[PDB]
Design a protein around this nucleic acid. Sequence first.
RNA 1: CGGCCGCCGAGACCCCGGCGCACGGACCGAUUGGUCCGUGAUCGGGUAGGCGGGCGUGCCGGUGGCGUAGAAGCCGGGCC
RNA 2: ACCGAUAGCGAACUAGUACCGUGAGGGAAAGCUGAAAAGCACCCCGGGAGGGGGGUGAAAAGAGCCUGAAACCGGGCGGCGAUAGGAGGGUGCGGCCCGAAAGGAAUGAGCCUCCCCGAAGGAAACCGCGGCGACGCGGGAGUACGAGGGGAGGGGACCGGGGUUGCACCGUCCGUCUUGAAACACGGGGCAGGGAGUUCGCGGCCGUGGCGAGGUUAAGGGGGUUAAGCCCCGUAGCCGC
Lengths: 151, 128, 121, 120, 92, 86, 51
Amino acid sequence: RFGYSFQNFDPKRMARASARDLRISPKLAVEVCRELRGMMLNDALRYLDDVIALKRPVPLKRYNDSQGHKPGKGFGPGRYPVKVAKAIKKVLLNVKNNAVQKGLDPDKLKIIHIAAHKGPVLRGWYPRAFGRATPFNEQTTHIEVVVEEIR
Amino acid sequence: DEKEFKRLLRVRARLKRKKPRFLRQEWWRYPKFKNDPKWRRPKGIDSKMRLKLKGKPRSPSIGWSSPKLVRGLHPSGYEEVLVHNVKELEALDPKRQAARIAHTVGKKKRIEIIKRAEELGIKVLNPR
Amino acid sequence: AKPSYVKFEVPKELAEKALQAVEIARDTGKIRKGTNETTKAVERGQAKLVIIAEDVDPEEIVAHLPPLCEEKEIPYIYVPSKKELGAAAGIEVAAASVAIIEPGKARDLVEEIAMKVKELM
Amino acid sequence: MKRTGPTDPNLRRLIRYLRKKSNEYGVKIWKDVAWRLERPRRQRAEVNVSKINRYANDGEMIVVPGSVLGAGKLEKKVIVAAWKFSETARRKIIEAGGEAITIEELIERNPTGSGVRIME
Amino acid sequence: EIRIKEIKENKLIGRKEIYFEIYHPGEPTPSRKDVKGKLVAMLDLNPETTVIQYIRSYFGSYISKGYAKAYDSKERMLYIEPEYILIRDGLI
Amino acid sequence: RIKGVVLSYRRSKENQHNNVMIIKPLDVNSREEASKLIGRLVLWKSPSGKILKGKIVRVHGTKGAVRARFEKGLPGQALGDYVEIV
Amino acid sequence: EDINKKEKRLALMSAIAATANYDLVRARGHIIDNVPQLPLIVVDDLQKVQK
RNA sequence: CGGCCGCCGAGACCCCGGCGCACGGACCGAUUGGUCCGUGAUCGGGUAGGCGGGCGUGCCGGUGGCGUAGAAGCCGGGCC
RNA sequence: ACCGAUAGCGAACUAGUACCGUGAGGGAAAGCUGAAAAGCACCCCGGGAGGGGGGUGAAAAGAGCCUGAAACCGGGCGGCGAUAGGAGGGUGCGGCCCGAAAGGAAUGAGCCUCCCCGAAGGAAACCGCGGCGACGCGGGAGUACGAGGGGAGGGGACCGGGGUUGCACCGUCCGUCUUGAAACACGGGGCAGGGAGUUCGCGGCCGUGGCGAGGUUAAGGGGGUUAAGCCCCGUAGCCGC
């Protein structure tokens, strides 16, 4: 895809980036983006690094079936989507570079919009018992982010 | 008589303000009915709407019709006439008819129609 | 021009200046739109400049205005269309007459219009 | 099914004219002929010169709300008005010395329709 | 209430064609004699040399449409107008 | 200006009339006393300040209640609420 | 569809009769302002023109 | 239990305005009809089924038109 | 007067092609950039895929290419939101929110005041009397009021309508067999598209039109025509007398 769901983007105070056709879990991508929204860019990068290092659980509020709780307050279902965090860190660095080349200050960027969408489905089949072949599909994800320099 | 005209216009206004939107049964339940809202007579053997029970939507009846003298008239009280060019614009009655420019008329012809209607003193419902 | 209340020819540029003057008056100061409201404004003397549309029909509702205003000695100007007059006044529907009671940000403009209309008649 | 009535504009106009004429002159013969003409096409009146000769007197005026046909023989001198005439019927009437006219001419000649006899 | 929507003159055939509309809310279709009288009275036409070609009513609308002709002289009518129309008018 | 309490709608066991309400004025406890208020207006004030108006048309029962007809029926949150007569 | 020969002949007769009328020809849509008269009969000379 | 007195309570009964229907009438349409008028306490629920009118889609013979100053199509609103 | 890519031949295309069965044999899906590739030169980030600038084009229509509906999913916006019960809706209104156009409206909106007439209906204060009593009778009075129909005065921008939600009352889904359906009877995850009184022969009727003691052609022939349209003939035959 090419478009963005953001409405009032302008090329003076905002910078945007995207990723298309990511072989990651859209559900966990949505759950991670929920917490990433409304945070400073550097703080979000540190949060993703912690999640990758397995030091900070990501809470689950929508898709949390058969998920055990975690130590500390607010847990509740949580897990560590390392693959999704690694995929989204690249998008965050890309938007940081976009802002820097545009002339914004990286230390004052705040993530004002970030979203994840389900993309095309890649199809395959798995053999089962009694002669049944059953779907076996990869769900790709689109990620969009736009940040604004606070002043 | 303008007095009866106004009285019946008010009567129709009240009646059509109280009139409900006639929609088929279970229009809300399924999207296939929401995107295409219509009314269809309930014909089932156990249909509650067909049985006309209280607490269920109503159905159209001949009694709901508006008074004859003002049926089909604009809320302003005039009479609509669809117009596609100046020739049929000129054939209206300014004291009793109004012109509605067809949606498919371009601006080039629409400006001409509007200026001609202004010259002839004929009301236009969509002057643009 | 229908002769019931039209007294003099108001040039197009003067009408445009009157329109923008009433626009700025509505934006900044206070105005009083409508025929009855304008009539009361001039009768009480709170108005400073009055604007009349040139497309009023029937004429018995706005004809009396200049006869009743020449008594109070208040400047009156004409504009082409009541539709545009009302649009400037800020109401979607037409405005036959308008009265400015304080020409905020428009003192000099109203003075110029008054001088020109006085010279004309 | 529904009775549409005659498709002939001339026949519809004649029916309406007959009703108006009956109203104007205060007589019922024209209304009677009107509804008799209105009856369904498959039942429209059919008359023959034989029957006209049988029942009509010399110099009498005859109105047939339908068609007149030339089956038989005719001696009487009769003024017959009918919606349609077969060529044989018209020729026989002319030879016998009568007149083959329409209900319009009949109305013009005898607006009150006094002495006119209806044959079906 | 008769309002004339068109008047046309044709001296080549020698007549005047009149297209008009009668606005009669709450009233039946006016009689042909009444319409002819009103039209002749308004247009100063000669009552003896004018015909009402047709009066038509369309559905619930109280605006009926009328077409009429007015000839200069009886010669043109006897030459053009058909016998059935002349009889219907009753002017012959 | 008198005070009154909105008791309920005009109702049968299972039927409700939305445009009529039963009102109990503060200091009337008889049909005779209540009948003197026939024709007077009744005002109900919305929480946002909007005012709804009705008029007293008849006396209800024998204990002093009255019937008030409202062009715009009360929302129903007015039940047990206060209204002003005149 | 089939139509009787006599009925077809009568219909043709009626059409030819209507072709010379004034009200119907004008009402159809044709513009007859400049026509000398109805029916418009022309001399035999019209049959020899091939340009 | 033998009675009684008030008050509530239906789309029922009465009234005001409106619609249609059946029947009759006047006037008026160039294909089944249209406008209005008079009576309806003795017209207005409805399954099977019978009958009349109307709304919508593709194409053809006519007639009158719109469109790159923006047609069809598609999303959300106003009016009838 | 055939269909217009789930239609029309199975195949509008590398279609009896790919694929299934040992075999005889069975047999799909799949059309569209733009006027011209002018099909994105260069810069930053990235392992790459690709992302952000910047260019081309009237319009990205960006090749995953005419339009881009619904189902479904993610974000923002407006409403409700952790003491509350009913097939998810109906009647009435109240909060919050939207409200340029098409609806009314400054030639006056909601609104406030006053005046007149008012159908059916219809009180009370007070006075006298009857009843053990609840209460009733006569006057007040057919009065105040009354659906609605009109008029005048003040103010000067809303009303109608729409989204969500709250309160009162009511309401046990849709189709179907059945005497009987909410049914612990059957068919009912959602959306889009397709989908079921057709043609001929004979016969009985009705609506209309032509001719009429007659009616009507069939096969076929000639003229004319770009043409199978159009004109005339054709009495064998069939029905009736």
